[PDB]
Structure formats: structure tokens, C-alpha cells
Amino acid sequence: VGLFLPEYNPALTDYWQTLRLRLFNLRHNLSIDGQPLSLAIYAEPTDPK
Amino acid sequence: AIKTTRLAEAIAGIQLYINRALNRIEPNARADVSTRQFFTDWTVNNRY
Known part of the structure; x- marks a missing residue:
């Protein structure tokens, strides 16, 4: 056997990816x-020495 | 992060169960019960 193989349907794979x-x-x-x-936080540094 | 209330979660769970049972995904669903007036209008009763 040196033939080619069938291929999946791209549209269904697109549906799965979107879901x-x-x-x-x-x-x-x-x-x-x-x-x-959601808003994050800054964690302000606590002064220099 | 996402919060909810007990009643909302119960509503979502029951809606999911009804959707699964109606579409013959869960086997052995009672056919006679699924023809009630409430379920016939499920196109309008599935959202609050």
C-alpha cells in the first residue's frame, strides 16, 4: 500500500476549538x-534606606 | 474568582439536568413524563 489517507473535516474541528x-x-x-x-494590585515598595 | 448564590446554582444545575435528559443523552428517561405542558414549552421556560 502506497496510497493516501482520508482527512478530517476542518469545520467540525473549528467548532471544537471555538467551544x-x-x-x-x-x-x-x-x-x-x-x-x-478583575483589577490587580500594585504592591507598593516600602521606602528606601 | 467567580461568585454565585445557592439558589442560582441550584437553578443552573436543574436546568442542566433537564437539558441532558430531554435530548436523550442520559438513557432511560421517562418518555411519558417528558411530554408534560411545562417541557413542551421548554423553548421559553429554559431562561428565567
């Missing part, structure tokens, strides 16, 4: 574009 990305964004408290929805 994975959306669920991951939802679970980690991010917007639909990946922008974080």
Missing part, C-alpha cells in the same frame, strides 16, 4: 476577548 476557547474564557473570569474582568 474549548469559550469555555476556558468563561471559567477563568475573563471577557469574550480574553480581557481580564
Whole structure:
């Protein structure tokens, strides 16, 4: 046998990838574009010597 | 990070269970029960 093999359908893989990305964004408290929805902290340095 | 309330989580859980059972994903669902008036209008009762 030296023939070629069948290929997957790209559209279904695109659906799966989109679903994975959306669920991951939802679970980690991010917007639909990946922008974080929570404010961070600065941890101001405590003066010089 | 994400917060919620007990009633909201219970609502989400029951909605998920109904969605799973109606679409014949979970086997052995009671066919007769799934034809009630409430479930017939599930297109409008699945959101608060």
C-alpha cells in the first residue's frame, strides 16, 4: 500500500476549538476577548534606606 | 474568582439536568413524563 489517507473535516474541528476557547474564557473570569474582568494590585515598595 | 448564590446554582444545575435528559443523552428517561405542558414549552421556560 502506497496510497493516501482520508482527512478530517476542518469545520467540525473549528467548532471544537471555538467551544474549548469559550469555555476556558468563561471559567477563568475573563471577557469574550480574553480581557481580564478583575483589577490587580500594585504592591507598593516600602521606602528606601 | 467567580461568585454565585445557592439558589442560582441550584437553578443552573436543574436546568442542566433537564437539558441532558430531554435530548436523550442520559438513557432511560421517562418518555411519558417528558411530554408534560411545562417541557413542551421548554423553548421559553429554559431562561428565567
